[PDB]
Amino acid sequence: MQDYTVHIVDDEEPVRKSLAFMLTMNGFAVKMHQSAEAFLAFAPDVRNGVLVTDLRMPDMSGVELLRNLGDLKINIPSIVITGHGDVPMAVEAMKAGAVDFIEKPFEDTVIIEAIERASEHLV
Ligand SMILES: [Mn+2]
């Protein structure tokens, strides 16, 4: 079986803990990051990891995070969670290299399938 880690980034702690807890209850190895900046500083050390990030985050957006990762010469399959009915954000996220976007609110089954898909990109 594959042993990958799901890295979660969200500006709202309650939403972050909700997702994290749900994925762990489903058997995924999960790591919650305090902010986009914290994940960016942790990124060089990631091995066999997938990223699930929120898009609208005041300090650093999900898109900007994706562009910074690219600058670090690092490729981490990413799923971007976008605001309800926010088309500009989903489009920009895909143009930025995200494996896929997920519109919230979302069904656990759906985010779980999106994560399994991103893991397809792990070498
Ligand atoms: Mn947000």
Curated annotation (Swiss-Prot):
**A GO cellular component entry from the record:** cytoplasm
Keywords of the record: Activator, Cytoplasm, DNA-binding, Magnesium, Metal-binding, Nitrogen fixation, Phosphoprotein, Plasmid, Transcription, Transcription regulation, Two-component regulatory system
**One record GO biological process:** nitrogen fixation
Ranges in coiled-coil conformation:
none
Q: Name one GO molecular function term.
A: transcription cis-regulatory region binding
Where does this protein chiefly localize?
cytoplasm
Q: Where is the Response regulatory domain?
A: 5-119
Q: Where in the cell is it found?
A: Cytoplasm
PTM comment: the record says:
Phosphorylated by FixL.
Q: What is this protein called?
A: Transcriptional regulatory protein FixJ
Species of provenance: Rhizobium meliloti (strain 1021)
- Within the intact protein, the region shown is 1 to 123 of 204
